[PDB]
């Protein structure tokens, strides 16, 4: 199996600027390579066929080059609607393999996340459930590390994380982290901490609370 590698899951760019996504085939697939673009909830769109040919209807801003083992997709001047996923794919020898994709994102001013932590509601506790929710909103860059601490020790079991793609309006990211325990275990601990590590502060952002303590 040939392996298409797109070393950059994400690439920061700006509207009106030039950007180049790279692809590296594990083997010489000659010129049998295609580039696709994909927007959320839609199917891929062919942009480049046979290494460096624009498919019909594909605007002059899109270009591709390479032939052999290294290929590169380029956008002369990025437009708002170009901030999507671009996939690499070799069709030299079966099985056809796709690269892992590269998502172009808008670069903006650094923004610290606003962190909020929430204890389990009384209604959930009555059902025998205990979820501690932590919101980390409107931050940039997307690079962030969320850790949960229970009575001091880090907890990794029972954590479910969810996040939104870059906002189309303020170019930030947001995330939700939920620690879900049973009421039994929740009531056997006292200290619950949500800890956010982001480049915007030397010290990680920390939010906590003590069971039964205001």
């Amino acid at each position: 199996d040939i392996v298409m590698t797109q070393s950059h899951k994400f690439m920061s760019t700006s509207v009106g600027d030039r950007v180049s996504i790279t692809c590296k085939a594990s083997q010489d697939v000659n010129t049998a390579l295609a580039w696709y673009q994909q927007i959320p909830g839609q199917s891929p769109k062919l942009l480049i066929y046979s290494a460096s040919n624009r498919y019909t209807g594909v605007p002059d801003r899109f270009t591709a080059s390479g032939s052999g083992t290294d290929f590169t997709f380029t956008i002369s001047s990025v437009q708002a609607e170009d901030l999507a996923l671009y996939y690499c794919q070799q069709h030299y020898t079966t099985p056809w393999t796709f690269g892992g994709g590269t998502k172009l994102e808008i670069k903006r001013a650094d923004a610290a996340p606003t962190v909020s932590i929430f204890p389990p509601s009384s209604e959930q506790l009555t059902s025998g459930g205990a979820s501690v929710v932590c919101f980390l909103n409107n931050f940039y860059p997307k690079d962030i590390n969320v850790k949960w601490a229970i009575d001091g020790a880090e907890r990794a079991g029972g954590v479910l994380n969810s996040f939104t793609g870059q906002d189309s309006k303020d170019s930030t990211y947001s995330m939700s982290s939920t620690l879900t325990l049973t009421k039994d275990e929740y009531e056997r601990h006292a200290s619950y901490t949500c800890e956010a590590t982001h480049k915007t502060s030397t010290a990680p952002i920390v939010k906590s609370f003590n069971r039964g303590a205001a």
Binding site: Y36, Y49, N137, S162, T164, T178, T180
Partner: protein
């Protein structure tokens, strides 16, 4: 006007298989081979195999050995995707065809068919109000409230704040599996406006015909 119409999404149980459909149109169906591609959130796009309606039958990807034995049928110009075992096969499946004669690149794609494998049955969500500890209203000029929705199936649920009148400063996150889809939403307003001016999350779950409007109140 080449067009590939895929089938609506389906929710098979962790055990059986499902035959997907793709209705080609706008071109002589038998002149091009049909391809199928899989797309999971963590593994990206993976080619499954092709089929010649003129009949050259198939050729599958090593990885999709017998779990994917394609099939087609002329006189209707539709291609089918069997899906055998099914359990980790939860994802979106695409129907793909090439453009020019000499380039295996896929110029034409179907809208995709979502497939979710789960043993769970339709289940209404529990909705839990998230308010800052000890009521109050934070310690700054802004306060964040929340709504936790969990234990439901299948997707989706719609969530709004104050019947939609509260839309700014809202963050509603993608639901994550776990037996009963669970998702949450946060809303951030001016500290002095809550609990002065009530805030309620409205959660609706079509599948169960259920709705829950949970008001967020100070708590101890």
């Amino acid at each position: 006007a080449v067009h590939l119409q895929g089938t609506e999404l389906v929710k098979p149980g962790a055990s059986a298989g499902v035959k997907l459909s793709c209705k080609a149109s706008g071109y002589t169906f038998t002149n091009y081979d049909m391809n199928w591609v899989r797309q999971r959130p963590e593994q990206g796009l993976e080619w499954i195999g092709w089929i010649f309606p003129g009949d050259g039958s198939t050729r599958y990807n090593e990885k999709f050995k017998g779990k994917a034995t394609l099939t087609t049928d002329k006189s209707s110009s539709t291609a089918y995707q069997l899906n055998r075992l099914t359990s980790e096969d939860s994802a979106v499946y695409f129907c793909a065809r090439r453009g020019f004669h000499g380039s295996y690149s896929f110029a034409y794609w179907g809208q995709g068919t979502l497939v979710t494998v789960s043993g769970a049955k339709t289940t209404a969500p529990s909705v839990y109000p998230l308010a800052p500890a000890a009521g109050a209203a934070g310690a700054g000029s802004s306060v964040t409230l929340g709504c936790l929705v969990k234990g439901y199936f299948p997707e989706p649920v719609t969530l709004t704040w104050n019947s939609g009148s509260l839309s700014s400063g809202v963050h509603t996150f993608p639901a994550v599996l776990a037996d009963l889809y669970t998702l949450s939403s946060s809303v951030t307003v001016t500290s002095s406006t809550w609990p002065a001016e009530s805030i309620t999350c409205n959660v609706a779950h079509p599948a169960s015909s259920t709705k829950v409007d949970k008001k967020i109140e100070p708590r101890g």
